[PDB]
Amino acid sequence: SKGEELFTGVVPILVELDGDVNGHKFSVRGEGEGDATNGKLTLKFICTTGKLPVPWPTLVTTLVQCFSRYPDHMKRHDFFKSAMPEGYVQERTISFKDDGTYKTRAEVKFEGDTLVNRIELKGIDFKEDGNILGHKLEYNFNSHNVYITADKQKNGIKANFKIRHNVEDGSVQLADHYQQNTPIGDGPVLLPDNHYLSTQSALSKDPNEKRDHMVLLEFVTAAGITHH
Amino acid sequence: GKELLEAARAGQDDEVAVLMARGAEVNAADDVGVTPLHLAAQRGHLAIVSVLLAFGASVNAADLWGQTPLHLAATAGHLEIVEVLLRSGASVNARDNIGHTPLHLAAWAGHLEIVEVLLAYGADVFAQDKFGKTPFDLAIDNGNEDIAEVLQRLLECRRDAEAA
Amino acid sequence: GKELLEAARAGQDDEVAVLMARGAEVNAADDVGVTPLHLAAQRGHLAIVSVLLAFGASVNAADLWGQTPLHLAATAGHLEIVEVLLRSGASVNARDNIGHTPLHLAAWAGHLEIVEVLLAYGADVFAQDKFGKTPFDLAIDNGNEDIAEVLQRLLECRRDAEAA
């Protein structure tokens, strides 16, 4: 449980994404700070490969759920800090309704004293006048709930949720997500109970920037096991 | 210029006194807008906050994420820093990017005396945020029990006063 | 505390701002009435004078011999200390026990620019002392050459203006 105790203060975070969508490659390097005692994430991402092909709100969920606030009477159900400092692997299949899809593989682990998250993304089957890559998505993001259950066969967790993205004309595009989180260590982890995780976030822009970027603030908590 | 912030992050109070004896700007932000006061406001460092404040400092300096020193000192739980920040003219109704006020964060984390201070310095209860929730909601859906109690007391007091 | 006077007496800037980061009374006198500002006014420091002044200090505190920081800084010859002391509200017409003004001592030591500054800050020429002598007398009986010239220029100008 030392992996739980190491999150006691601020932790600096660096994240690197190498993505390729329809042969169109790009990178996203993000830096920032995170507080796991109170579930706060303050990050800033920059595209180091020129103009971004894909709207930012689709990539936010790809771009560290070990920084979620668990209350004390639910400390028995914290899987993610149990898998530290060795790390773990996350597999996501992202289904965009009536469009193409994403497949993403990520590794989350400490390097030195910095939590790095590496991510390889492959997106296919999107129509060239689709509202995703036609740049019709709005620059705001909503609050959500994510449902989590155990898996003793892979000794990790299965995760599902469904995101509503905002379009210009008031329409709503839905993206479903499938996710597996499995450790790379072999020691003991915490097998959690069936519960959910609530999320608020805010996207913004930096005034004195010239590159393509995004500034993100996020709050995440967990609930479902409503014990006294 | 840039070896000031390092000594605030790090708890090196004597190095702060040495840099303040010489000429050094207290209002310095590196890449994001963040100040030695912001850094000494996250981690309690009552001595460094007081010496940065006595030499004159932006008490309400906008972070890139919209945060001010009061937000960080209310999130962390340092009561004395919140007292000395409020006595020096900090605004109790400053907003976060998500829409949070300092009372929202104080109710979210679960500090009681900080809520009692912010309520005694002019913070209002039923102020919404961008997603639409009041501090009472954050208090009830995060297991904080007596924060929700004094908030429900204030709501019932206002509602029963309006019913006449 | 009482460790501060060693600090300013020494020239130890860093050990002055450390003691001032803590709680320390600037208005402290050990056996004779003498202040850390008095000690940094006798010897020359600009840095300790400015940091003791920014933390709030009695700019004109009477020594046992009646001296203020301005008397000591005018006798010694530190020009920048006299400028920063005069800008902070020091009185130019404080009197010594023997009756001297800061202009008397500046004329006695022989600093020209300090005389020009004190003349520009409201010190008068023909002010007596207890033995009855003006600064012009001290200039003539102490080998200071140009001091006596600008003093006689001002005296003759006033006398010839009264003659009409």
Residue numbers in the entry:
A (entry chain C): 2 to 64, 68 to 232
B (entry chain A), C (entry chain B): 54 to 217
Paper text:
In this study, we present a novel DARPin–apoferritin scaffold, with a larger size of around 1 MDa and higher octahedral symmetry, meticulously engineered for the binding and imaging of small target proteins via cryo-EM. Our most efficacious constructs, namely models 4 and 6c, feature a designed ankyrin-repeat protein (DARPin) rigidly linked to an octahedral human apoferritin via a helical linker. The 24-subunit apoferritin framework allows the attachment of up to 24 target proteins without steric hindrance, an extraordinary feature. The modular design of our scaffold allows the adaptation of new DARPins through minor amino-acid-sequence modifications, enabling the binding and visualization of a diverse array of proteins.
In higher resolution regions, the β-strands of GFP, the α-helices of the DARPin and the side chains of the residues were clearly defined in the sharpened density map. The atomic details of the β1–β3 and β7–β11 side chains, along with the backbone, are essentially clarified. For β4–β6, aside from a few amino-acid residues, the majority of the main and side chains are also clearly presented. The GFP chromophore and its adjacent amino-acid residues were detailed at near-atomic precision, setting a new benchmark for cryo-EM imaging of small proteins [Figs. 3(b) and 3(c)]. The attachment of GFP to the DARPin induced no significant alterations to the backbone structure, with a root-mean-square (r.m.s.) deviation of just 0.646 Å.
